[PDB]
Amino acid sequence: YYECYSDVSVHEEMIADQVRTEAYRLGILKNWAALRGKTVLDVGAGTGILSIFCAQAGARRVYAVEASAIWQQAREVVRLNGLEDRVHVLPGPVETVELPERVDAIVSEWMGYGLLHESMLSSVLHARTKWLKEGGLLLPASAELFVAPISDQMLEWRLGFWSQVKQHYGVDMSCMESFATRCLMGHSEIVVQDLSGEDVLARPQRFAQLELARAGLEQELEAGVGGRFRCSCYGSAPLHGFAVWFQVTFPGPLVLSTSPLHPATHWKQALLYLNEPVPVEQDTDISGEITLLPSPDNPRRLRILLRYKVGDHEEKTKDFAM
Amino acid sequence: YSDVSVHEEMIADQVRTEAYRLGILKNWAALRGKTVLDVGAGTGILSIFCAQAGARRVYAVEASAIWQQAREVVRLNGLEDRVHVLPGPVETVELPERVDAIVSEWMGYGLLHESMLSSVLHARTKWLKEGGLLLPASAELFVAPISDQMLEWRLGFWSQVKQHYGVDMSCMESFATRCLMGHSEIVVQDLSGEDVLARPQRFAQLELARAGLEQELEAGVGGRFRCSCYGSAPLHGFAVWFQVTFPGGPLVLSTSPLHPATHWKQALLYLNEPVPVEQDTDISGEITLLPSPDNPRRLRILLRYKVGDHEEKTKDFAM
Ligand SMILES: NC(=[NH2+])NCC[C@H]1O[C@@H](n2cnc3c(N)ncnc32)[C@H](O)[C@@H]1O
Ligand SMILES: NC(=[NH2+])NCC[C@H]1O[C@@H](n2cnc3c(N)ncnc32)[C@H](O)[C@@H]1O
């Protein structure tokens, strides 16, 4: 983990994510009145680009706390922009860092795949408890989870591939389709893949909301985060499972979304495949509940417990891990 | 290989699958009425190509659980009379006769990574008749110095941050070069002809009919090379790729960046830093493909090179 964020690739991926980086830039600059002349704490600053956005927004003092080796690159970026007097890159975890003062605001890019995989939300909440002033600002302030049933067209392509071999090469391989379905759908993994609007089978349902200012959100991460949903299918298509994505809200309201209906990001969406495709029709009712949990082996690994019911079928469950 | 994705990836590789189909079908005269051994048949698609080419019998040996799907595929094509799927490794399988030909899809990344060449050589010694047909029959290894254009854009990205967000990050290019080039790992990436700095050089050839080739793989495979640069560009390292040659009745399946792309792409051997070169800059050296000391299935590459008047350097790559 320390080895990943000390490398260039993940930071190159995060900054080249134009939708994400421009959203944080605007969400910060939009809060100029709340940041002008104030102090900011950046949890997991990486290269320090968000700390510099806060200084450009008028912040008097920004502390860029970064645990991996990339803090030495953040120091170089900050001096390269002539900002080391206002932006102080501090190495180490935010839980053991020593600030000279409680800060007026906390900014952090903490979200992982499925919102909570390999996430540093607990590190941000730990910094909110220890260093945020009473009534301080949080950027982003909240995260919203969404779910929708899907008919993954790419999966349908990989499933029908074996029925298409004979047209191209003359060898009938349609008997592979039953075997390919079990291999691509029978597993219990969370699949990270980006879908389009054509894949969405019903109206996306918002099933959970996390307000980062709430005390006790820390304990609820251990118990599990999620909620219940109900939707009606747009039309007839094979139900492959569900897509789970998130958005974060900045106090303005600016929204950074990872929805398939909105421009793509590096998070894509988290796909929960059923064991087999399920035929559904227009106005088919799909209800259930989804819980985002830490894996019992690794508290940084996202586990998702799915409970669902399709029409008159009996309620089923499935247990996913990243 | 009991999972579908690797077989789906192999068959979706149109350049690879069509080359094997033609190397088999164009050998109809040599395969008509003859027997074929398919080493690692997987789904059995190559064994059915050999049947259409005219083979009187094909033994499709497969060691993973995918042999049950190949058993179904052969039945679905009405060919279980002359195509027989036999489970287990080719080293312990019992055939009723020696065969006239061997067909096998055995090449891995860098030709010899997660390859089954030894199993094919084991089957050549045990089951192939004298002078029998091998499909493919040989493999040719190539090297060319490269200026990776994708690597240069990944390096130049940090100087472009100030234009969009107003934060200068050009100090990262020095740090990104060490991280993307200072490692000692074989990078599997596909290049184009624009990346090639000099005329590709063949530095080794493997003849699959040769007994004792298996012992030579364990000592190392490769040879020397010499090339002069096309023009001026930063030298980032060397790309290694292969081609397999079928006996004609001569079709070649290439993984060169100058030829249509395959799933093997090319094996990129990056230097620690970029090296400026110009037109007619002579690059000489030697490359050896070896089994890793930790894992004999894992490809290691010893690179020894000299750029112009610079001192001869070496670098030790693994997959
Ligand atoms: N946004 C994400 N999904 N991940 C961002 C992780 C970034 O925050 C850094 N980071 C993670 N946890 C911490 C922590 N407790 N304290 C400081 N930096 C941290 C990590 O080094 C990397 O730069
Ligand atoms: N990896 C490749 N270059 N080709 C695919 C390997 C295929 O050959 C099969 N295979 C590999 N080694 C052997 C062996 N010794 N005997 C039989 N089948 C084998 C493997 O199960 C898979 O279906």
HEC string for B187-204: EEECCCHHHECECCEEEE
Reply yes or no on whether B105 is catalytic.
yes
CA distances from B261 to B14, B237, B241, B245, B265 (A): 9, 20, 12, 17, 6
Reply yes or no on whether A109 is catalytic.
yes
Task: Decide: A115 and A84 in contact? Cβ < 8 Å.
Answer: no
Q: Is B194 annotated as a binding residue?
A: no
Burial A260-286 (b: 16+ CB within 10 A, else e): beeebbebbbbbbbbeebbebeeebeb
Q: Around B310, how many Cα atoms within 13 Å sit in the side-chain half-sphere?
A: 16
Query: Going by DSSP bridges, is the β-strand pair A316-321/A237-250 parallel, antiparallel, or unpaired?
Result: unpaired
Task: Decide: A121 and A221 in contact? Cβ < 8 Å.
Answer: yes
Task: Decide: B42 and B68 in contact? Cβ < 8 Å.
Answer: no
CA distances from B306 to B235, B249, B287 (A): 12, 42, 12
Within 10 angstroms of residue B120's Cβ, the number of other Cβ atoms is 25
Mutate to test the interface with A, among B172, B174, B178, B185 (most CBs of A within 10 A): B172
- Exp. method: X-ray
CA–CA–CA angle B46, B99, B38 (5° rounding): 25
* B266 CA to centre of own chain: 8
Pocket test for ligand 2, best of B93, B116, B319 (most atoms within 8 A of CB): B116
Mutate to test the interface with B, among A173, A177, A182, A185 (most CBs of B within 10 A): A173
From CA A102, how far away is CA A89, in angstroms rounded?
Answer: 16
Q: Is the peptide bond before B234 cis (omega within 30 degrees of 0)?
A: no
Which of A46, A132, A139, A40 has the alpha carbon at shortest distance from A91? Answer: A46
Nearest residue (CA) to ligand 2, atom 13:
B40
Nearest residue (CA) to ligand 2, atom 6:
B40
Quote the minimal CA–CA distance from B178 to chain A in Å: 9
Residues 6+ apart with CB under 8 A from B150: B189, B191
Amino acid of residue A252: G
Query: Going by DSSP bridges, is the β-strand pair B221-228/B252-254 parallel, antiparallel, or unpaired?
Result: unpaired
Name the H helices within chain B: 4-12, 14-25, 28-31, 45-52, 67-76, 117-127, 149-156, 161-165, 172-181, 213-219
From CA A267, how far away is CA A271, in angstroms rounded?
Answer: 12
Chain-chain contact of B72 with A175 (C-beta, under 8 angstroms): yes
Tokens of B252: 């070649």
Q: What is the DSSP letter of B273?
A: E
For chain A, what percentages of helix, strand and coil (3-state, to nearest 5) are there?
30, 35, 35
Task: Decide: A250 and A30 in contact? Cβ < 8 Å.
Answer: yes
User: Which ligand 2 atom is the nearest neighbour of the CA of B115?
Assistant: 3
Query: Going by DSSP bridges, is the β-strand pair A103-108/A39-43 parallel, antiparallel, or unpaired?
Result: parallel
From CA A24, how far away is CA B5, in angstroms rounded?
Answer: 38
With a 6 A CB cut-off, is B63 part of the ligand 2 pocket? yes
Q: What is the DSSP letter of A54?
A: H
Which of B15, B16, B59 has the alpha carbon at shortest distance from B40? Answer: B59
CA distances from B53 to B45, B57, B137 (A): 13, 11, 17
Q: Taking every pair of C-alpha atoms in chain A, what is the biggest distance, in angstroms?
A: 74
